[PDB]
Design a protein around this nucleic acid. Structure first.
Lengths: 57, 78, 133, 134, 57, 77, 132, 132
DNA sequence: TTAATATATACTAATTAATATATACT
DNA sequence: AGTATATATTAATTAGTATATATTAA
């Protein structure tokens, strides 16, 4: 029976997650399912950091 | 500057630990040091676990083995 | 890493208490978490209740659990159990009711399932196993 | 108090959505907690994965769970399971598999277990039951 | 696609992409594997049974 | 010897063996490695200095402190 | 478990960004915690402040820290530091002053210290891992 | 306000326990916070481990710590350490490894550093107070 | 140039810690 | 004497609600 509030962050919409549903990761995948969406953790990318570290040089 | 209260639990004296000093073990070693005491985490070793079980006499668990039957094929939804 | 012990490893540890078992457990416990599913504990409690020497067997089980983390079979495990049960049935692979719950729990926790006898356990997709003998 | 729904109640609710079920749920929800064991959820998730219309069935299950509490099968249930399984076998009775885990869970939570029929949970001691006729 | 996890007060939050915006102020949160489903929250058991009947029929 | 950890309310507690009982209703808690020291708490800084003066020991750092400059490393490019 | 990176591992990662280090970090992060002592961060911040390309080097360190846990050098660490420093001096072996704090933090946290020079191996009760 | 004690003030307090030190401490403690960095504690724990009368010295240190706050060397301190170390080196100013960490900690906490030996005298943005 | 990114804060609700007892058992 | 668990009340901490705003990549 857990509920989450929708609020605005800048010009984007956001969902405030209850403590029990907190993610230990930084990004999540978003896929539609019926009237809603499913959120799955994306691996804590060390690839993403090494790419920008190489970009700065 | 941290403080902890002394209270009674049964006929024993006890010290209520502040959250920052909580132990992740169920037993601790108590050693004197001057007017006070040192408390250190004291977990039972796996060797001590196996020695304590060896002291206890009993019949074997699952003598005929485990009866883990398979589930039936169900067609709950369309 | 989380190491989840299968029922068979636990039953052999309580009944036969082999030295190799405690040496393997003490080695892993230094840098890893040794746990059991509440599904394994349900099976172990059944083993105790079924026995003649209930009090002694409970005592031995209680001592064995002093060094383990009991992980609750949670809502997160259910999607993996659903997928695993369907897939095993599709391939014609038969697994016992509890073993199927225990395997799916190991998968949900991304844990290594420690098994006494492998058998069809290797045939279980996305499951990390380790065999002791 | 806690009312835990069994698998059969849940499957019938999703598939047949009877009015009597929602009236009992709405009445009970006002002063009690409606829940399901994570063991029931394991069975319902298997129902979804097995089906042809996976997306729709998941959607219907997600809607069904929205006003429910999912209770994890915990270490406190294990003692009751061991005692119940042993007693049922001693009497030559079988309420196999997950239904034994489900029943143990209601006993451990001191909950009323909600059923669809007399076969699901038979002659099971220390278990409070409530039958909702189909 | 993907969504970022950020902090709002002492709560964790997910920034929704525009295509996945909700027209409601509160959502239902349900676990699914390592992740979650966010969906419109039916007000009551009657709405729950009505909503399930719409998917099937 | 050994002491058991138990719950009192939502707080964790240590049950003291009889030989280690305190005659005060509050103690000083100090960390030491993975554990803690429990001792009587002096009422003031004067009582702190008086209690240290009672203890006879050799001086710490008799030759002084050997605080050498920070170690050198190659850093960025 | 906890993997604590040494200063030299961090400096080489930021400067040379080797695939080998990335590979290691992407693999370990899946089931373990990648972290650094606040002592390492003190040294890395000094590397940035000292640098000609201050702004860029801060940006690169900020990106590097995004998937890292910074662990404070705590009161629990002090007992291990005192014991380790005394023991090393008694055996006549010489370790860098910051390295001695970083090692005693890894011991206090029961963490694996990731280094660029294992032959650190003389330090008692310390778990090490060398990356090439 | 926060008054952070330096290693030398601590060592003199434990070894010599002077009348003037406890009077200054008692006076400040009424409206201010008396504290030490975990870096100071690392040094004092090393002093204990190195000594012949370990048990007694630990007891004295434990009593000394009973009325002060031990502040962990945190992530916030690191930026100040990097800036301070660079500046001191640029000016050719020598400072011991631990004193540099202790000074940066006071700066980060916006605390008054209590010193025994004046020449800390040349460290920028550091508030000092000398006891005799 | 409009989402999105990143951070920040005043406040109040909700939750969890701590205080201080109670009890029956081994 | 110690083990084990219980719980009401208040104290304290931590989560959540609501909002704001200056930048930056799509």
């Amino acid at each position: 029976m857990n509920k989450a509030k929708i609020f605005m962050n800048g010009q984007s919409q956001a969902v405030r997650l209850p403590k029990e549903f907190r993610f230990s990761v930084k990004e999540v995948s978003v896929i539609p399912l019926g009237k809603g969406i499913v959120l799955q953790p994306l691996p804590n990318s060390w690839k993403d950091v090494f790419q920008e570290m190489a970009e700065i040089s | 500057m941290n403080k902890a209260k002394i209270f009674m639990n049964g006929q024993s004296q006890a010290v209520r630990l502040p959250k920052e000093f909580r132990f992740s073990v169920k037993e601790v070693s108590v050693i004197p040091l001057g007017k006070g005491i040192v408390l250190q985490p004291l977990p039972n070793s796996w060797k001590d676990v196996f020695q304590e079980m060896a002291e206890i006499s009993s019949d074997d668990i699952f003598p005929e083995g485990r009866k883990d039957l398979p589930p039936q094929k169900r067609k709950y939804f369309e | 890493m989380i190491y989840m012990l299968g029922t068979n490893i636990c039953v052999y540890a309580i009944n036969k208490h082999p030295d190799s078992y405690y040496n393997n457990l003490e080695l892993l416990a230094k840098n890893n978490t040794i746990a059991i599913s509440s599904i394994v504990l349900a099976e172990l409690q059944y083993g105790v209740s079924k026995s003649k020497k209930k009090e002694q067997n409970q005592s031995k089980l209680d001592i064995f659990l002093s060094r383990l983390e009991i992980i609750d079979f949670s809502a997160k495990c259910t999607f993996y159990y659903g997928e695993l049960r369907t897939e095993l049935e599709q391939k014609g692979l038969i697994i016992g009711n509890n073993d199927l719950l225990i395997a799916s729990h190991a998968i949900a926790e991304n844990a290594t399932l420690v098994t006494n006898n492998i058998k069809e356990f290797k045939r279980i997709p996305n499951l990390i196993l380790e065999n002791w003998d």
